[PDB]
Design a protein around this ligand. Structure first.
Ligand SMILES: [O-][O-]
Ligand SMILES: [Ca+2]
Ligand SMILES: [Cu+2]
Ligand SMILES: [Cu+2]
Length: 607
């Protein structure tokens, strides 16, 4: 049955660091040593991961796939293996309906500090349950340690791992049959929302918006991650203050400057150059997706030779800055890995730089006129946010526990849990009042966004600047009958959030329970933290005509950031509409058509 199939998949992913401590099918794999940190960005690591998941994809049927897997995990790098098997489980038809084990439970040592992991391994020296509180103690000397609740959140780092595995940069469409609709553009939009959401935490905390890493000579600020790799005793190398990017054997920094300059040229000329010397136009309909593919870069870049691989070489050269040529035999920092790279403050400097390349392009597009915004005869008359106090959302920290036993060797304890704390918010709902003055039923997509109202120094953020910090809260279809309507929507139904990741124990049992994919934003992080007086945000609701938006769907719980399984992205509008193009008005209230509304709410943290 499917429940048996699920138990056999959980066992692929169990004590995977110990899994080490051949078949002509597995001849090109086994290059990266077990114990080494696997890079999700480096070309030669992604090549070996592709080779392994190609074997898994061509495995004649499910039992043959558990077999080759059970064997390849004996010798290949274990990070590489979790990567290749989760791409296989997501895409193989005979794995449909099967969940992959939670990644923070496969690799507990990437989500919890060396100190807690060591204490757990230590106190495992009866039968009894170990519990370690992660919570530390120390001289808080760095103001950045204030955003650690966001950067080091378990749920955000697990989402980023899972997104890059629904949308692989090595995805070859001709080999799979299958195309990933608007993969380049969703690369863009997901990493833009991670930056936009991060800048709402800086401003929540009284800090300035993050500045782009746009000059490659400037020294980086430092960050020590304090993560071990128990599979070998290696750690993610820390980065002290004041180092500058240095050439690696595989890439020179001047080659990166050169890729940036070639990309900006094409954006200012309106066309890119295909491999055959010909011109492809950066039209309004495909321009962001062509640019996503050559900036990341993916396998689908129109010209890899000429535009290179800028975003991904940025991860590799920042992760190796402590040892650019390998003479120290030191492991990369957390920027090498999609499960850890959001922890480092430098992630946001680099991805606001990359976002600025997409924004130059968006800036060559014409502002929307009233025609492309308006949904005529629809008028929005009111939004209210209902919570304990109406139009105030409350946030707070909350304790949680993570089970380490399926990922580190447990001996005889039945359970080693580490307890950590994370931001969370009270439940809320919206109520939108809409007047439908046609005399027919209409169908609307309701689009909901949140935007800070003022910067950290109390100045009003103008309309155009709001575009960079507006975060998506929801997108859903509603039918409207003639006359007055009131749409009610609950926060829990958010289409940017994962509603539930089942644990290893939920799954080996039948308690992980269609919506079986793990990509999606964490529910506890739906809104920014705000601050203890109540930080003011604009809440924007827009309705547009769904018969013009619409494009059997598994895995749509987080459609907005993750798309739909094996399906086209279900919204024809550009990702981030209405905020993706230049707004020529000083104030956001003068942008508003009748089918748009802003309500000012407050987010108020409780200490
Ligand atoms: O990749 O972020
Ligand atoms: Ca959801
Ligand atoms: Cu990135
Ligand atoms: Cu990423």
């Amino acid at each position: 049955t499917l429940h048996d199939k699920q138990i056999r998949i959980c066992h692929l992913f169990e004590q995977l660091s110990s899994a080490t401590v051949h078949s002509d099918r597995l001849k090109n794999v086994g290059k990266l040593q077990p114990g080494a940190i696997f890079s999700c960005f480096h070309p030669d690591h992604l090549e070996e991961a592709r080779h392994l998941y190609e074997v898994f994809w061509e495995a004649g049927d499910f039992n043959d796939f558990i077999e080759i897997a059970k064997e390849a995990r004996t010798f290949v790098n274990e990070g590489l293996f979790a990567f290749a098997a989760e791409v296989a489980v997501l895409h193989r038809d005979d794995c449909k309906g099967l969940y992959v084990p939670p990644v923070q439970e496969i690799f507990p040592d990437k989500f919890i500090p060396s100190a807690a992991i060591n204490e757990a391994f230590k106190k495992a020296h009866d039968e009894s349950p170990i519990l370690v509180d992660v919570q530390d103690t120390g001289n808080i000397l760095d103001p950045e340690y204030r955003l650690a609740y966001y950067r080091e959140d378990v749920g955000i780092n697990a989402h980023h791992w899972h997104w890059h595995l629904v949308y692989p940069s090595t995805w070859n469409p001709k080999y799979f049959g299958k195309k990933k609709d608007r993969k380049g553009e969703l690369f863009y939009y997901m990493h833009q929302q991670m930056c936009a959401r991060y800048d709402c935490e800086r401003l929540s905390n009284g800090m300035h918006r993050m500045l782009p890493f746009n000059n490659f000579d400037e020294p980086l600020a430092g960050y020590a991650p304090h993560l071990t790799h128990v599979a070998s005793g290696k750690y993610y190398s820390p980065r002290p203050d004041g180092l500058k990017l240095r050439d690696l054997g595989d890439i020179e920094i001047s080659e990166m400057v050169r890729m940036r300059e070639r990309i900006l040229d094409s954006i200012h000329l309106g066309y890119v150059i295909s491999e055959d010397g010909s011109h492809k136009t950066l039209d309004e309909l495909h321009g962001t997706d062509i640019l996503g593919a050559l900036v990341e870069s993916s396998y689908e870049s129109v010209n890899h030779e000429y535009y290179g691989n800028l975003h991904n070489w940025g991860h590799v050269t920042m992760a190796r800055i402590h040892d650019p040529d390998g003479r120290f035999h030191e492991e990369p920092g957390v920027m090498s890995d999609t499960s850890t790279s959001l922890r480092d403050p430098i992630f946001y400097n680099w991805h606001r730089f990359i976002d600025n390349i997409f924004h130059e392009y968006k800036n060559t597009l014409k502002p929307y006129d009233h025609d492309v915004l308006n949904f005529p005869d629809i008028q929005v008359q009111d939004v209210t946010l209902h919570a304990r106090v109406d139009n105030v959302v409350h946030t707070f920290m909350r304790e949680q526990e993570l089970e380490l036993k399926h990922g580190i060797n447990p001996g005889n304890a039945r359970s080693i849990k580490a307890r950590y704390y994370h931001l969370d918010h009270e439940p809320f709902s919206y109520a939108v009042n809409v007047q439908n003055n046609s005399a027919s039923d209409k169908h609307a997509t309701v689009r909901i966004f949140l935007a800070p109202k003022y910067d950290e120094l109390g100045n009003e953020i103008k309309a155009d600047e709001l575009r960079r910090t507006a975060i998506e809260l929801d997108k859903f279809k509603t039918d409207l009958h003639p006359g007055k309507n009131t749409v009610v929507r609950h926060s829990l139904d958010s289409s940017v959030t994962l509603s539930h990741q089942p644990t290893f124990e939920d799954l080996l049992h039948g308690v992980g329970l269609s919506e079986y994919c793990s990509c999606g934003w964490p529910s506890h992080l739906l809104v920014p933290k705000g601050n203890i007086k109540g930080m003011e945000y604009h809440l924007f609701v827009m309705l547009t005509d769904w018969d013009k938006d619409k494009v059997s769907v598994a895995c749509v719980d987080a459609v907005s950031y993750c798309g739909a399984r094996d399906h086209k992205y279900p919204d024809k509008k550009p990702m981030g509409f209405p905020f993706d193009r230049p707004i020529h008005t000083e104030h956001i209230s003068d942008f508003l058509t009748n089918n748009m509304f802003i309500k000012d709410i407050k987010i108020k943290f409780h200490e």
